Amino acid sequence: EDMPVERILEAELAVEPNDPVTNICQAADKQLFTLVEWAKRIPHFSELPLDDQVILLRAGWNELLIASFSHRSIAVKDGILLATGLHVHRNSAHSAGVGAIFDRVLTELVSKMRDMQMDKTELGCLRAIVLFNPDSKGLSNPAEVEALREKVYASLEAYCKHKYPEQPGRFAKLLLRLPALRSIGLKCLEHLFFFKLIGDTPIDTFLMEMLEAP
Amino acid sequence: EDMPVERILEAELAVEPNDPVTNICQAADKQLFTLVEWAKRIPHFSELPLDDQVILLRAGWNELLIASFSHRSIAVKDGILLATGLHVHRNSAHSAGVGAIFDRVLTELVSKMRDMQMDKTELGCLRAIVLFNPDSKGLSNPAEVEALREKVYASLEAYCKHKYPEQPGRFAKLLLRLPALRSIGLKCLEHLFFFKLIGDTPIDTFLMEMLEAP
Amino acid sequence: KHKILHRLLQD
Amino acid sequence: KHKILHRLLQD
């Protein structure tokens, strides 16, 4: 109850108006601060204990950021638009060694979002569903986080069917992108950990904190 | 069109009536043969080009097998029931070094399936949704695999709501388990690759083939 | 490659 | 741990 798609949409509209890898890490650090402000605008999120908020964000920041720059790259040819205003072309990522994952982002995420014209409201709800991850370890009250997730996709299903009556499978189509997002989120982390290990590629404070333990 | 939940249920009912790790690998090799017979019983699957069938199975065997022994372990205390008839207790997995992942299986999968009383028809459809993975690389016709997936969750949503009218969020609850399944499927592979690398822990032919390249 | 899998699917 | 994240959430 009390999980209007209007509040979710506002969260999205409120937080967003040479080495390609270095530019990506710099952009992720920038968005991490914005991610916190976005979360706060999500209904009931701020009402959760401070500790559970840290857990939810530290467990989903990567998938939440990946979902954002992807949907933002829908109108882009073969690349993505970074929050910093920089465009990372497919060939540029390839010439940097991170072509395998970058291609997975374009094919499994960016392209798919574009094929179904996923709107901002739909993007917001999905991210909200990710934020409210009841499987996050250490949660003081996983059941509560679970109840919130259910309220999100309940409002999302209502949005669809009503906004896109002619598309009865839209709701499932959106939810069936989370697995790809999960798989891609995990691989991106692996790369970031390797980048931190090798030493090359500068990494800012907030990004570095997210790469902490656990 | 033509994706009846009755045919999917029959596929499930037709394929199923000391080192814990060694027992797990032996069970996965056993089920791999059964997985092929199960797939063949899935509508339209066999109609796909032989090559695409190899791709779909090699890309989902791990998540498909994990979903199966989990649902089978619903009545189990703190462990799982292997196809070989052997029970792997939580403490046994822990004393073998694979306690982290085994716990994720019990909490994120086994327990959840039990909390919602996921039935065999529901289990069948989910696996079918996994089998029909349109994101599998190399697919001769990904669109077709996509159309099949849509027919599966379309029949699944129909099954629910009609079988469980009082639970409007059941459909989404089932689909929202795939991300956990994807994450767990990937970690299990990592372990298997390490087991093959170290040399210890016997690995049969079919399992070994699945651990091939790509 | 994929000897086993292919043979099983063809049968 | 998690200095930054905590400070940002509290504000």
Ligand SMILES: CC(=C/C/C=C(\C)CC(=O)O)/C=C1\CC[C@H](C)c2ccccc21
């Ligand atoms: C976890 C992560 C986040 C990036 C977030 C960004 C750039 C957000 C934004 O700028 O809006 C890291 C990625 C995101 C995806 C690209 C392709 C990538 C490639 C190689 C290594 C890492 C990464």
Ligand SMILES: CC(=C/C/C=C(\C)CC(=O)O)/C=C1\CC[C@H](C)c2ccccc21
């Ligand atoms: C990919 C995989 C499949 C197992 C399949 C089985 C046992 C099927 C079955 O017996 O029905 C491997 C697992 C499945 C899950 C358990 C906990 C595990 C633990 C450590 C390493 C690997 C594995």
